[PDB]
């Protein structure tokens, strides 16, 4: 019945959150629970750029106001993204061939969303999942249109547009200090910040199998060590949800001064993509599973 958010800021971080959005907070128990537990939240789908921009400079921002409602109505943290990710390109994107052409629609889109919710938005994810699995950068629209470029672009322009806000870079499989795309990303990080690209963070896009969590406590502190001020644990669940995964997590989050806090993927198993796993800390009825308990407990002690 405790918070983890609470216990964790009582641990010296900055919060506990979770990714929801206005079909959630409608439904089952989430929001009470997210009143609860959570001190972050996250729009799972709603300021994606098929969600917010359907058309050209047509932009839609139903779904992503009612959250920012809903989180400044409850004291809530807000984390916003993402504002440059190949996964949800709406089509007239993904067909522009022409390099001022991309440039000029890509820092549009990010200083209209970023405007918008100026100084209300604590992190914001501008760039997501740029590497492949070998560490090369990810031959996405933005790569083979406007080239390397586009990553210092995209983070400029969100400097310009809220510099209240913490500018983060995301990706997954950086679960594992050897692995080649954390070596990229923390090596690639290095020399754009040395360059004075305004990159804040890294955002660990923390989706694990069972017993993955044990290497997170090397991986962890290899990604802290590009020298970001901040690195987050982003979108986490674990198959299977044993408490010996989360705690592994949470405790390499403990050990690393820079991770500011920890954000899961969603609230109950039943509403996860991968449900059959039932990878999350809520069960089917919104009881609190023993590897929530079993986090409660670590940060207690």
């Not at 990710?85 to 001022?100: A, C, E, G």
């Not at 950086?174 to 990229?184: E, G, I, M, N, R």
Request: hydrophobic share 40%; proline share 5%.
């Amino acid at each position: 019945a405790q918070s983890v958010d609470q216990l964790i800021k009582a641990r010296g971080k900055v919060y506990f959150g979770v990714a929801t959005d206005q079909n959630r907070l409608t439904t089952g128990k989430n929001a009470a629970i997210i009143q609860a537990d959570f001190g972050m939240v996250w729009p799972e789908n709603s300021m994606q750029w098929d969600a917010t921009e359907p058309s050209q400079g047509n932009f839609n921002f139903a779904g992503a106001d009612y959250l920012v409602n809903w989180a400044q109505q409850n004291g809530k943290l807000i984390g916003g993204g993402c504002l440059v990710w190949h996964s949800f390109l709406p089509s007239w994107v993904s067909s522009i061939t022409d390099k001022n052409t991309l440039t000029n629609v890509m820092k549009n889109h990010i200083t209209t969303l970023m405007t918008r919710y100026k100084g209300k938005i604590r992190t914001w994810d501008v760039v997501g999942e740029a590497f492949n699995e070998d560490g090369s950068l990810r031959q996405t629209v933005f790569l083979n249109v406007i080239g390397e470029d586009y990553i210092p672009i995209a983070f400029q322009t969100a400097r310009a547009a809220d510099p209240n806000a913490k500018l983060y870079i995301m990706d997954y499989n950086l679960d594992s200090a050897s692995y080649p795309k954390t070596q990229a990303i923390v090596n690639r990080v290095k020399q754009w910040r040395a360059a004075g690209v305004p990159i804040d963070g890294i955002g660990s896009q923390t989706h694990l199998s069972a017993g993955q969590g044990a290497g997170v406590l090397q991986a962890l502190p290899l990604l802290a060590s590009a020298g970001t001020p901040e690195v987050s644990i982003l979108m986490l669940d674990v198959a299977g949800a044993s408490p010996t995964d989360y705690v592994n997590v949470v405790n390499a989050c403990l050990n690393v001064q820079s991770c500011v806090g920890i954000t899961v993927m969603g609230v109950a198993d039943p509403d996860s993509v991968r449900a059959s796993t039932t990878p999350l800390l809520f069960d089917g009825n919104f009881n609190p599973k023993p590897a929530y308990n079993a986090i409660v407990q670590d940060l207690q002690q």
